[PDB]
Amino acid sequence: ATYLIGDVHGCYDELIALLHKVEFTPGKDTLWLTGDLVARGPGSLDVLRYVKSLGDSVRLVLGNHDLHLLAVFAGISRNKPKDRLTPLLEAPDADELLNWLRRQPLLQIDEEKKLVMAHAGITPQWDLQTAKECARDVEAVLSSDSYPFFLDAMYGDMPNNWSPELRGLGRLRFITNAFTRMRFCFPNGQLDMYSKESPEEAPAPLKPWFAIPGPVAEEYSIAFGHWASLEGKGTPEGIYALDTGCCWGGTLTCLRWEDKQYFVQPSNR
Protein backbone atom coordinates (compact mmCIF):
# COMPACT_ATOMS: atom_id res chain seq x y z
CA ALA A 1 0.00 0.00 0.00
CA THR A 2 0.90 3.70 -0.41
CA TYR A 3 0.85 6.04 2.62
CA LEU A 4 1.30 9.82 2.54
CA ILE A 5 2.12 11.72 5.73
CA GLY A 6 2.30 15.47 6.31
CA ASP A 7 4.86 17.57 8.12
CA VAL A 8 6.49 15.52 10.90
CA HIS A 9 8.55 18.32 12.51
CA GLY A 10 10.50 16.01 14.79
CA CYS A 11 7.37 14.30 16.11
CA TYR A 12 8.98 10.87 16.01
CA ASP A 13 6.70 9.15 18.57
CA GLU A 14 3.56 10.24 16.67
CA LEU A 15 5.05 9.17 13.34
CA ILE A 16 5.82 5.68 14.62
CA ALA A 17 2.44 5.31 16.32
CA LEU A 18 0.69 6.33 13.10
CA LEU A 19 2.76 3.88 11.02
CA HIS A 20 2.04 1.06 13.50
CA LYS A 21 -1.67 1.84 13.26
CA VAL A 22 -1.56 1.08 9.52
CA GLU A 23 1.03 -1.72 10.01
CA PHE A 24 3.37 -0.03 7.54
CA THR A 25 5.65 -2.74 6.14
CA PRO A 26 8.69 -1.65 4.11
CA GLY A 27 9.04 -3.77 1.00
CA LYS A 28 5.28 -4.16 0.75
CA ASP A 29 4.31 -0.52 1.41
CA THR A 30 5.71 2.84 0.35
CA LEU A 31 5.65 6.02 2.43
CA TRP A 32 5.46 9.52 0.95
CA LEU A 33 6.49 12.43 3.19
CA THR A 34 5.68 16.08 2.47
CA GLY A 35 8.92 17.39 4.04
CA ASP A 36 9.73 19.47 7.11
CA LEU A 37 10.88 16.31 8.86
CA VAL A 38 12.81 18.34 11.42
CA ALA A 39 12.45 21.24 13.88
CA ARG A 40 10.04 22.28 16.69
CA GLY A 41 9.18 18.75 17.79
CA PRO A 42 11.69 16.96 20.04
CA GLY A 43 12.86 14.12 17.79
CA SER A 44 14.43 15.50 14.62
CA LEU A 45 17.46 13.21 15.05
CA ASP A 46 15.38 10.05 15.31
CA VAL A 47 13.11 11.09 12.43
CA LEU A 48 16.05 11.61 10.07
CA ARG A 49 17.67 8.34 11.12
CA TYR A 50 14.46 6.41 10.51
CA VAL A 51 13.48 8.01 7.20
CA LYS A 52 17.01 7.62 5.79
CA SER A 53 16.92 3.94 6.81
CA LEU A 54 13.78 3.41 4.71
CA GLY A 55 15.70 3.70 1.43
CA ASP A 56 13.47 3.02 -1.58
CA SER A 57 10.41 2.52 0.63
CA VAL A 58 10.15 6.29 1.20
CA ARG A 59 9.64 9.16 -1.26
CA LEU A 60 10.49 12.47 0.39
CA VAL A 61 10.33 16.10 -0.73
CA LEU A 62 12.34 18.79 1.08
CA GLY A 63 10.60 21.62 2.92
CA ASN A 64 11.66 25.04 4.13
CA HIS A 65 12.69 23.79 7.58
CA ASP A 66 14.78 20.99 6.08
CA LEU A 67 16.62 23.61 4.01
CA HIS A 68 17.03 25.87 7.06
CA LEU A 69 18.58 22.94 8.94
CA LEU A 70 21.05 22.46 6.08
CA ALA A 71 21.85 26.18 6.23
CA VAL A 72 22.55 25.98 9.98
CA PHE A 73 24.72 22.90 9.52
CA ALA A 74 26.79 24.69 6.85
CA GLY A 75 27.27 27.80 9.00
CA ILE A 76 25.11 29.98 6.72
CA SER A 77 22.30 30.62 9.26
CA ARG A 78 22.06 30.87 13.03
CA ASN A 79 20.46 28.14 15.13
CA LYS A 80 17.24 29.09 16.90
CA PRO A 81 16.77 27.34 20.26
CA LYS A 82 13.06 26.79 19.55
CA ASP A 83 13.92 24.57 16.55
CA ARG A 84 15.45 22.02 19.01
CA LEU A 85 18.04 20.94 16.45
CA THR A 86 21.08 20.68 18.73
CA PRO A 87 20.94 16.89 19.35
CA LEU A 88 20.79 16.33 15.59
CA LEU A 89 23.57 18.85 14.87
CA GLU A 90 25.81 17.33 17.56
CA ALA A 91 25.18 13.68 16.64
CA PRO A 92 28.16 11.57 15.52
CA ASP A 93 26.29 10.74 12.27
CA ALA A 94 25.23 14.36 11.61
CA ASP A 95 27.35 14.55 8.46
CA GLU A 96 26.00 11.29 7.06
CA LEU A 97 22.40 12.32 7.80
CA LEU A 98 22.59 15.84 6.38
CA ASN A 99 24.58 14.81 3.31
CA TRP A 100 21.79 12.31 2.64
CA LEU A 101 19.11 14.96 3.30
CA ARG A 102 20.44 17.52 0.84
CA ARG A 103 20.37 14.90 -1.97
CA GLN A 104 16.58 14.37 -1.71
CA PRO A 105 14.12 15.72 -4.30
CA LEU A 106 11.98 18.84 -4.20
CA LEU A 107 9.33 17.07 -6.28
CA GLN A 108 7.92 13.52 -6.53
CA ILE A 109 5.87 12.29 -9.52
CA ASP A 110 4.10 8.94 -9.96
CA GLU A 111 2.52 8.58 -13.39
CA GLU A 112 0.62 5.37 -12.65
CA LYS A 113 -1.09 7.06 -9.69
CA LYS A 114 -1.28 10.41 -11.50
CA LEU A 115 0.12 11.84 -8.27
CA VAL A 116 2.46 14.79 -7.65
CA MET A 117 4.02 15.79 -4.30
CA ALA A 118 5.89 18.94 -3.31
CA HIS A 119 6.24 20.60 0.08
CA ALA A 120 4.04 23.64 -0.61
CA GLY A 121 2.31 22.50 -3.82
CA ILE A 122 2.61 23.40 -7.50
CA THR A 123 2.29 27.04 -8.47
CA PRO A 124 -0.39 27.47 -11.16
CA GLN A 125 2.19 29.32 -13.28
CA TRP A 126 4.00 26.02 -13.88
CA ASP A 127 3.25 23.18 -16.20
CA LEU A 128 4.63 19.76 -15.38
CA GLN A 129 7.72 19.95 -17.56
CA THR A 130 8.68 23.32 -16.05
CA ALA A 131 8.16 22.04 -12.52
CA LYS A 132 10.44 19.07 -13.29
CA GLU A 133 13.20 21.24 -14.74
CA CYS A 134 13.09 23.68 -11.83
CA ALA A 135 13.20 20.84 -9.31
CA ARG A 136 16.19 19.38 -11.15
CA ASP A 137 18.00 22.73 -11.16
CA VAL A 138 17.69 23.30 -7.41
CA GLU A 139 18.40 19.64 -6.61
CA ALA A 140 21.59 19.92 -8.63
CA VAL A 141 22.74 22.86 -6.54
CA LEU A 142 21.81 21.17 -3.26
CA SER A 143 23.62 17.94 -4.05
CA SER A 144 26.80 19.76 -5.14
CA ASP A 145 29.91 20.52 -3.11
CA SER A 146 28.94 24.19 -3.35
CA TYR A 147 25.50 23.92 -1.71
CA PRO A 148 26.32 26.42 1.12
CA PHE A 149 26.55 29.20 -1.47
CA PHE A 150 23.14 28.26 -2.84
CA LEU A 151 21.64 28.09 0.64
CA ASP A 152 22.96 31.56 1.36
CA ALA A 153 21.51 32.83 -1.91
CA MET A 154 18.09 31.21 -1.43
CA TYR A 155 16.88 33.65 1.25
CA GLY A 156 14.72 36.42 -0.20
CA ASP A 157 11.13 37.13 -1.18
CA MET A 158 11.56 38.27 -4.82
CA PRO A 159 10.97 37.75 -7.66
CA ASN A 160 7.44 36.42 -7.05
CA ASN A 161 6.33 35.96 -10.66
CA TRP A 162 7.55 33.16 -12.92
CA SER A 163 9.11 33.68 -16.35
CA PRO A 164 11.17 31.27 -18.49
CA GLU A 165 13.46 34.30 -18.86
CA LEU A 166 14.44 34.40 -15.19
CA ARG A 167 18.14 33.72 -14.66
CA GLY A 168 20.56 33.31 -11.80
CA LEU A 169 19.75 34.14 -8.21
CA GLY A 170 16.21 35.29 -9.00
CA ARG A 171 15.39 32.05 -10.81
CA LEU A 172 16.65 29.86 -7.96
CA ARG A 173 14.91 31.96 -5.30
CA PHE A 174 11.61 31.81 -7.10
CA ILE A 175 11.91 28.05 -7.57
CA THR A 176 12.64 27.62 -3.85
CA ASN A 177 9.81 29.87 -2.70
CA ALA A 178 7.35 28.17 -5.03
CA PHE A 179 8.24 24.65 -3.85
CA THR A 180 8.76 25.27 -0.13
CA ARG A 181 6.99 28.48 1.01
CA MET A 182 4.00 29.17 -1.27
CA ARG A 183 0.50 29.57 0.16
CA PHE A 184 -1.47 32.46 -1.41
CA CYS A 185 -1.39 33.80 -4.97
CA PHE A 186 -2.52 36.99 -6.60
CA PRO A 187 -5.14 36.49 -9.32
CA ASN A 188 -2.45 36.28 -12.02
CA GLY A 189 -0.64 33.52 -10.10
CA GLN A 190 1.98 35.75 -8.47
CA LEU A 191 3.22 34.57 -5.07
CA ASP A 192 2.52 36.33 -1.78
CA MET A 193 5.23 35.63 0.82
CA TYR A 194 3.68 37.16 3.97
CA SER A 195 0.21 35.73 4.68
CA LYS A 196 0.31 32.43 6.58
CA GLU A 197 -3.31 32.41 7.78
CA SER A 198 -6.29 30.29 6.72
CA PRO A 199 -8.08 31.12 3.44
CA GLU A 200 -11.13 32.40 5.35
CA GLU A 201 -8.99 34.84 7.38
CA ALA A 202 -6.99 36.16 4.44
CA PRO A 203 -7.32 39.63 2.89
CA ALA A 204 -8.59 39.97 -0.67
CA PRO A 205 -7.70 39.52 -3.50
CA LEU A 206 -5.48 36.68 -2.25
CA LYS A 207 -6.54 33.15 -3.11
CA PRO A 208 -4.99 29.77 -2.28
CA TRP A 209 -2.60 28.64 -5.00
CA PHE A 210 -4.82 25.59 -5.48
CA ALA A 211 -7.90 27.82 -6.06
CA ILE A 212 -6.34 29.06 -9.33
CA PRO A 213 -6.65 26.50 -12.15
CA GLY A 214 -3.24 25.38 -13.26
CA PRO A 215 -2.17 22.84 -15.85
CA VAL A 216 -0.56 20.41 -13.38
CA ALA A 217 -3.60 20.35 -11.10
CA GLU A 218 -5.84 19.68 -14.10
CA GLU A 219 -4.08 16.43 -14.98
CA TYR A 220 -2.70 15.22 -11.63
CA SER A 221 -3.67 14.99 -8.02
CA ILE A 222 -1.38 17.07 -5.80
CA ALA A 223 -0.41 16.26 -2.22
CA PHE A 224 1.44 18.79 -0.08
CA GLY A 225 2.15 19.86 3.48
CA HIS A 226 3.52 23.18 4.81
CA TRP A 227 0.31 25.17 5.29
CA ALA A 228 -0.70 24.25 8.81
CA SER A 229 -3.28 27.02 9.27
CA LEU A 230 -5.22 25.34 6.45
CA GLU A 231 -5.74 22.44 8.88
CA GLY A 232 -6.02 20.05 5.92
CA LYS A 233 -9.47 21.41 5.02
CA GLY A 234 -11.15 23.38 2.27
CA THR A 235 -9.33 21.98 -0.76
CA PRO A 236 -10.83 21.01 -4.14
CA GLU A 237 -11.04 17.44 -5.36
CA GLY A 238 -7.64 16.13 -6.33
CA ILE A 239 -5.84 18.43 -3.85
CA TYR A 240 -4.66 16.84 -0.59
CA ALA A 241 -3.38 19.10 2.20
CA LEU A 242 -1.67 16.76 4.67
CA ASP A 243 -0.26 19.23 7.25
CA THR A 244 -2.56 19.23 10.30
CA GLY A 245 -0.06 20.74 12.72
CA CYS A 246 1.25 17.86 14.82
CA CYS A 247 4.15 19.86 16.25
CA TRP A 248 1.68 22.63 17.21
CA GLY A 249 -0.51 20.28 19.24
CA GLY A 250 -2.79 19.39 16.34
CA THR A 251 -2.58 15.97 14.66
CA LEU A 252 -0.36 13.95 12.35
CA THR A 253 -2.36 12.79 9.32
CA CYS A 254 -1.75 9.75 7.10
CA LEU A 255 -3.61 9.19 3.80
CA ARG A 256 -3.71 5.72 2.24
CA TRP A 257 -3.81 6.30 -1.52
CA GLU A 258 -5.53 3.10 -2.70
CA ASP A 259 -8.80 3.81 -0.83
CA LYS A 260 -8.24 7.52 0.08
CA GLN A 261 -8.66 6.52 3.72
CA TYR A 262 -7.40 8.86 6.48
CA PHE A 263 -5.66 7.81 9.71
CA VAL A 264 -4.90 10.39 12.39
CA GLN A 265 -2.53 10.43 15.37
CA PRO A 266 -3.09 13.04 18.10
CA SER A 267 -0.17 15.19 19.17
CA ASN A 268 1.37 14.06 22.47
CA ARG A 269 2.01 17.73 23.28
Ligand X SMILES: Nc1ncnc2c1ncn2[C@@H]1O[C@H](COP(=O)(O)OP(=O)(O)O)[C@@H](O)[C@H]1O
Provide the minimum distance between the beta carbon of 24 and ligand X in the complex, in angstroms, as a whole number. Answer: 24
Which stretch of DSSP H or E encloses residue 20? helix 12-21
Would you count residue 232 as binding ligand X (CB under 6 A)? no
Between residues 65 and 102, which has the closer beta carbon with respect to ligand X?
65
Taking residues 51 to 80 in sequence order and writing x for each that binds ligand X by CB under 6 A, - otherwise, the string is: -------------xx---------------
Contact present, 2 and 253 (Cβ < 8 Å)? no
162 binds, among ligand X, Mn ion, none (CB under 5 to 8 A by kind): none
Task: Indicate which of ligand X, Mn ion, none lies near residue 173 (CB less than 5 to 8 Å, by partner kind).
Answer: none
Residue 184 one-letter amino acid: F
Burial 151-190 (b: 16+ CB within 10 A, else e): bebbeeeebbebeeebeeeebbbbbbbbbbbbbbbeeebe
Nearer to ligand X, 35 or 105 (CB): 35
110 part of the interface to ligand X, by CB under 6 A: no
264 binds ligand X (CB under 6 A): no
Decide if residue 229 touches ligand X (CB under 6 A): yes
**Chain centroid to CA 233:** 17
Residues from 185 through 204 that contact ligand X (CB under 6 A): 196
Angle at the Cα of 167 (from 161 to 170), degrees rounded to 5?
50
Q: From CA 25, how far away is CA 44, in angstroms rounded?
A: 22
**14 forms part of the interface with Mn ion (CB under 5 A):** no
Give the DSSP H or E segment for 262.
Answer: strand 261-266
Q: How far is the CB of 29 from ligand X (least distance, A)?
A: 27
Under rule CB under 6 A, residue 228 binds ligand X: yes
Q: How far apart are the C-alpha atoms of 3 and 30, rounded to whole Å? A: 6
How near is the Cβ of 40 to ligand X at its closest, in Å?
Answer: 8
Quote the least distance from Cβ 118 to Mn ion, whole Å.
11
Q: How far is the CB of 36 from Mn ion (least distance, A)?
A: 4
234 scored as a contact of ligand X (CB under 6 A) = no
Report the residue number, 7 or 83, with the smaller CB distance to Mn ion.
Answer: 7
State which amino acid sits at residue 219.
E
Q: Which stretch binds ligand X (CB under 6 A): 77-85, 127-135, 184-192, 225-233?
A: 225-233
Q: Contact at 8 Å (CB) between 186 and 205?
A: yes
| Residue 40 interacts with Mn ion (CB under 5 A): yes or no | no
Under 8 Å between Cβ of 223 and 116: yes
* Closest alpha carbon to 210 in 235, 192, 174: 235
- Segment contacting ligand X by CB under 6 A, of 86-94, 224-232, 233-241, 254-262: 224-232
Q: Of 236, 243, 180, 182, whose CA–CA distance to 211 is shortest?
A: 236
Q: How many CA atoms lie within 13 A of 22 on its CB side?
A: 28
Which residues bind to ligand X, rule: CB under 6 A?
Answer: 64-65, 196, 227-229, 231, 245, 248, 250
Which residues bind to Mn ion, rule: CB under 5 A?
Answer: 7, 36, 63-64, 226
